[PDB]
Design an enzyme around this catalytic site. Structure first.
Site, mmCIF file in Angstrom:
data_model
loop_
_atom_site.group_PDB
_atom_site.id
_atom_site.type_symbol
_atom_site.label_atom_id
_atom_site.label_comp_id
_atom_site.label_asym_id
_atom_site.label_seq_id
_atom_site.Cartn_x
_atom_site.Cartn_y
_atom_site.Cartn_z
ATOM 1 N N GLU A 1 0.820 -1.207 0.000
ATOM 2 C CA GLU A 1 0.000 0.000 0.000
ATOM 3 C C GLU A 1 0.856 1.260 0.000
ATOM 4 O O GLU A 1 0.459 2.279 -0.577
ATOM 5 C CB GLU A 1 -0.942 -0.006 1.202
ATOM 6 C CG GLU A 1 -1.835 -1.231 1.285
ATOM 7 C CD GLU A 1 -2.622 -1.469 0.014
ATOM 8 O OE1 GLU A 1 -3.214 -0.502 -0.511
ATOM 9 O OE2 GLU A 1 -2.653 -2.622 -0.461
ATOM 10 N N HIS B 1 -15.094 -12.484 -11.067
ATOM 11 C CA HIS B 1 -14.706 -11.622 -12.175
ATOM 12 C C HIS B 1 -15.432 -11.972 -13.468
ATOM 13 O O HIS B 1 -15.122 -11.412 -14.525
ATOM 14 C CB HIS B 1 -13.194 -11.676 -12.381
ATOM 15 C CG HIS B 1 -12.410 -11.116 -11.236
ATOM 16 N ND1 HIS B 1 -12.030 -11.875 -10.152
ATOM 17 C CD2 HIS B 1 -11.935 -9.870 -11.007
ATOM 18 C CE1 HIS B 1 -11.356 -11.121 -9.303
ATOM 19 N NE2 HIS B 1 -11.283 -9.900 -9.798
#
Ligand SMILES: *[C@@H]1O[C@H](CO)[C@@H](O[C@@H]2O[C@H](CO)[C@@H](O[C@@H]3O[C@H](CO)[C@@H](O)[C@H](O)[C@@H]3O)[C@H](O)[C@H]2NC(C)=O)[C@H](O)[C@H]1NC(C)=O
Ligand SMILES: *[C@@H]1O[C@H](CO)[C@@H](O[C@@H]2O[C@H](CO)[C@@H](O)[C@H](O)[C@H]2NC(C)=O)[C@H](O)[C@H]1NC(C)=O
Ligand SMILES: *[C@@H]1O[C@H](CO)[C@@H](O[C@@H]2O[C@H](CO)[C@@H](O)[C@H](O)[C@H]2NC(C)=O)[C@H](O)[C@H]1NC(C)=O
Ligand SMILES: *[C@@H]1O[C@H](CO)[C@@H](O[C@@H]2O[C@H](CO)[C@@H](O)[C@H](O)[C@H]2NC(C)=O)[C@H](O)[C@H]1NC(C)=O
Ligand code: NAG
Ligand code: NAG
Ligand code: NAG
EC number: 3.4.17.23
Lengths: 201, 596
Positions: B357, B487
């Site tokens: 991150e 997905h």
């Protein structure tokens, strides 16, 4: 000499409310003794740049009048206020001549101007037909035209309002925090000099 | 004054007023996510649609400018994003139906339930439970039961919904000057600007399987080794000739092979590398972790992060009734505001996630000077690759010893290195064929090469040669196996994950080459090297202002996407596997099946 009639710098740097950049305030200072040491010897100023003369030597010489121009801009736009600079502010709002003499002071005021819901009082010009001349103030609110057809008032396809507001918020990072700017210019017309510092003894 | 000046004036008017509204929407979203309550729900909506309610009109106004006479490349590229008709080109009565079908498909997928027939009053969901059963268990019968049940109660009703979805989206595709939805997806990997850097949509098709063929020798050895280990684990259930079934992989769809690491560990006498107990002993809190994750980037050469990130970001442990959904995220709220969100704990996994991150935040901060519509990565694969580079480079034993977590008198040897390499290979290289096969099948089904009847058989026959998976129990035409995937039912492109790996490995190889390192690539590090940081920054600061082919010219020396660094990374593992399975034969037989 007893050193009296001090120039009122407190009414300028400590004013309650400042004006927008497109309507910057101009104040005339004359016929008083001025002490720039109290201004230079302060740690509350983020930017203090003197172009014409060195700050230390300023306490000796003196002129016939001084002009103080005050307004509020964004954090990233302070670098545009200098001789030989270009940008939105330097073209449509405030322009300084290349032979400028004086000083520029700028300090952060995030804790005052910013508001939790957003402060939208301050405005600035976004479009103009031509670049501004030095020390020229334009406050007209004529509707801009960019295309070829002329628009009768109301905004059309290529007709935009020339003034846009600022969106200051408490959490914006130093790039977008409001900054208060005061520019001091010294003018030395043929009249006898009146504005210079104390006779130290 | 031509239309080129009018376009500049319009863009200058647009972005200034778009910035504030986007900032308000992001602020509302963050306020809801950090503080889950009903009072903070409607606010999000009250901002969200409004942002869209502003984006439509500016999209409507960006049509009177004929974007074929604008000569400035930057202005034309910036204007191209606005001129996207999207779903507005479809009729309203069909757009509402499309929205409804997407909503009902998402709800059906998110509301799956399976009850064991002996106990019909207690169904389990895809939440921990059924997924835990499929991932961590050792039983053939229950694994087969769970697989068949999930594909039989979610994969049956989705067939007509998907059938209508395909044709409706395809009609939208022709409505938007594309002959297929596959072209609409591939349009992001397309540039027609600077000479010598042009890239067409169709070139990606020939470019994918061209670079996939080099990986097959490496994948075959892994397949053989895993099959041999499973045979040594499961008796008389896997033939040495055929390929392993679908429900023995360790995942519901077999996307990742990480869960299988326990069975296929090479030689586990020596312990694995763990420093979590060392972190607990030294009393490391969240602040220490996030400061050691910042000193690394400072040492590399990237700028230090702004003040206020330490004040606004919800770093750790909301605690009481003040709940929060804390899937780890990095937020770029605009107007020079950056934040992070995580429920950090004292674990090495959280350390690596913090590094990931942190890299995301650095990349977001890099291109803050670009205009509003150009603040993104060059393509969809660069952002995650940049994020994962730091995670790769912050786990080496040398870096751990530098910050004094591992013992200063630690000596590494053959087995720990080989074990770590195989552990990483089970996740990185073991998922490429699955993604390639899924994307190929979706491209063909959108193109209409395979008709309606040839759906459930083409999928499973192709999976045999591409992946090496057989039918546990046959499905004829009444199932929709690919629909049981996140997905695939939520309308998400799946080609990003294939290019992400190759991009990250090319970047790592280039940086390590321009970091003065000697030895195998997997032990390399990019710490205390300012020139590598400058080289990375020269590409990070570009943003979406330049074609991604040119972006792949300052980090590496070749614009094309190749696979040589991938093979160079797993060289010791490959050369160990060459002599490992000296008695078995690599490759599978496509005809053997468990049932016949
Ligand atoms: C605008 O208002 C501020 C706030 O009052 C002024 O700054 C403050 O000015 C006073 C005196 O002008 C300073 O007081 C100092 O106190 C020490 C003892 O503590 C004394 O030794 C000094 O001689 C001086 O009297 C004060 O430090 C200073 N700062 C603050 C935070 O209060 C400012 O001067 C005003 N603007 C102008 C242009 O005068
Ligand atoms: C498209 O327009 C932009 C903005 O007008 C141009 O950007 C300028 O590029 C020059 C190149 O040295 C810089 O010196 C300027 O500072 C940039 N900004 C401006 C406002 O001029 C860009 O070069 C143009 N692209 C072309 C002409 O191909
Ligand atoms: C998006 O939709 C608009 C609205 O129909 C399209 O604009 C029309 O395009 C056709 C041919 O392409 C012209 O005959 C019409 O005169 C256009 N109408 C208007 C109002 O511009 C546009 O082509 C579509 N595609 C985009 C913008 O990429
Ligand atoms: C970002 O990092 C730089 C480099 O360490 C900091 O610069 C110095 O930081 C040390 C300790 O962090 C201070 O003792 C020095 O006074 C700093 N010097 C200067 C010139 O800044 C910088 O302060 C850091 N910034 C933030 C916001 O953490
Ligand atoms: C001079 O100014 C000081 C200021 O405090 C004052 O006390 C003093 O009386 C003044 N003297 C004269 C002669 O003006
Ligand atoms: C979270 O939202 C509730 C709902 O209004 C509010 O009462 C509470 O103060 C909020 N907490 C924080 C930390 O903002
Ligand atoms: C490492 O491998 C070399 C080469 O096979 C061997 O000589 C050595 O004994 C090995 N060391 C360990 C600890 O396995």
């Amino acid at each position: 000499p007893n050193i009296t009639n001090l120039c009122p710098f407190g009414e300028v740097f400590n004013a309650t409310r400042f004006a927008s950049v497109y309507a910057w305030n101009r104040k005339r200072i004359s016929n008083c003794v001025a002490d720039y040491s109290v201004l230079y010897n302060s740690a509350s100023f983020s930017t203090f740049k003197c172009y014409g003369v060195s700050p230390t030597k300023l306490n000796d010489l003196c002129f016939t009048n001084v002009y103080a121009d005050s307004f509020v801009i964004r954090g990233d736009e302070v670098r545009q206020i200098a001789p030989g600079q270009t940008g939105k502010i330097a073209d449509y709002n405030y322009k300084l001549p290349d032979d400028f003499t004086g000083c520029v002071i700028a300090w952060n005021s995030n804790n005052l101007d910013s508001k939790v819901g957003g402060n939208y009082n301050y405005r600035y010009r976004l479009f103009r037909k031509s670049n501004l001349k030095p020390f020229e103030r334009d406050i007209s609110t004529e509707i801009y035209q960019a295309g070829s057809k002329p628009c009768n008032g109301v905004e059309g396809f290529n007709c935009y309002f020339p003034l846009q507001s600022y969106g200051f918020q408490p959490t914006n990072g130093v790039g977008y925090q409001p900054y208060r700017v005061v520019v001091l210019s010294f003018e030395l017309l043929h009249a006898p000099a009146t504005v210079c510092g104390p006779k130290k003894s | 004054s031509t239309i080129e000046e009018q376009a500049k004036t319009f863009l200058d008017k647009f972005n200034h007023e778009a910035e504030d509204l986007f900032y308000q929407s992001s602020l509302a979203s963050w306020n809801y996510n950090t503080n889950i309550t009903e009072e903070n729900v409607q606010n999000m909506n009250n901002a969200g649609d409004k942002w869209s309610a502003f984006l439509k009109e500016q999209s409507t106004l960006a049509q009177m400018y004929p974007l074929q006479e604008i000569q400035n490349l930057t202005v034309k590229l910036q204007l191209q994003a606005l001129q996207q008709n999207g779903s507005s080109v479809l009729s309203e009565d069909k757009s509402k139906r499309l929205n409804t079908i997407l909503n009902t498909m998402s709800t059906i997928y998110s509301t799956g339930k399976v009850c064991n027939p002996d106990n019909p009053q207690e169904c389990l969901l895809l939440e921990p439970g059924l997924n835990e059963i499929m991932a961590n268990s050792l039983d053939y019968n229950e694994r087969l039961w769970a697989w068949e049940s999930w594909r039989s109660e979610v994969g049956k009703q989705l067939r007509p919904l998907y059938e209508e979805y395909v044709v409706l989206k395809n009609e939208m595709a022709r409505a938007n000057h594309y002959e297929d939805y596959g072209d609409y997806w591939r349009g992001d990997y397309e540039v027609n600007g600077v000479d010598g850097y042009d890239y067409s949509r169709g070139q990606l098709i020939e470019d994918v399987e061209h670079t996939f063929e080099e990986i097959k020798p490496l994948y075959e050895h892994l397949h053989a080794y895993v099959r041999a280990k499973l045979m040594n684990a499961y008796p008389s259930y896997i033939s040495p000739i055929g390929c392993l079934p679908a429900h023995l992989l360790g995942d519901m769809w077999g996307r990742f092979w990480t869960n299988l690491y326990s069975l296929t560990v090479p030689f586990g006498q020596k312990p694995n590398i763990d420093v979590t107990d060392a972190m607990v002993d030294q009393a490391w809190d969240a602040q220490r972790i996030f400061k050691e994750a910042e000193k690394f980037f400072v040492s590399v050469g990237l700028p230090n992060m702004t003040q206020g990130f330490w004040e606004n970001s919800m770093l750790t442990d909301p605690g009481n009734v003040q709940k929060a959904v804390c899937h780890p995220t990095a937020w770029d709220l605009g107007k020079g505001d950056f934040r992070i969100l995580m429920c950090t704990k004292v674990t090495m996994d959280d350390f690596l996630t913090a590094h990931h991150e942190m890299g995301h935040i650095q990349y977001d901060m890099a291109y803050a000077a670009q205009p509003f519509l150009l603040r993104n990565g060059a393509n969809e694969g660069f952002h995650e690759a940049v994020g994962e580079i730091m995670s790769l480079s912050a786990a080496t034993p040398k870096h751990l010893k530098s910050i004094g977590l591992l013992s200063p008198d630690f000596q590494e040897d053959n087995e720990t290195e080989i074990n770590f390499l195989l552990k990483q290979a089970l996740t990185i290289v073991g998922t490429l064929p699955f993604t390639y096969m899924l994307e190929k099948w979706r491209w063909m089904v959108f193109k209409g090469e395979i008709p309606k009847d040839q759906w459930m058989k083409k999928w499973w026959e192709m999976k045999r040669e591409i992946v090496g998976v057989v039918e546990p129990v046959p499905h004829d035409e009444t199932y929709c196996d690919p629909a049981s995937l996140f997905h695939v039912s939520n309308d998400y492109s799946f080609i990003r994950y294939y290019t992400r790996t190759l991009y990250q490995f090319q970047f790592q190889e280039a940086l390590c080459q321009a970091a003065k390192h000697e030895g195998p690539l997997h032990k390399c590090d990019i710490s205390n090297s300012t020139e590598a940081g400058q080289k990375l920054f020269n590409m990070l600061r570009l943003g979406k202002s330049e074609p991604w082919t040119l972006a792949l010219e300052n980090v590496v020396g070749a614009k094309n996407m190749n696979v040589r660094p991938l093979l160079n990374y797993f060289e010791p593992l490959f050369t160990w596997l060459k002599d490992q399975n000296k008695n078995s034969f690599v490759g599978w037989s496509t005809d053997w099946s468990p049932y016949a």
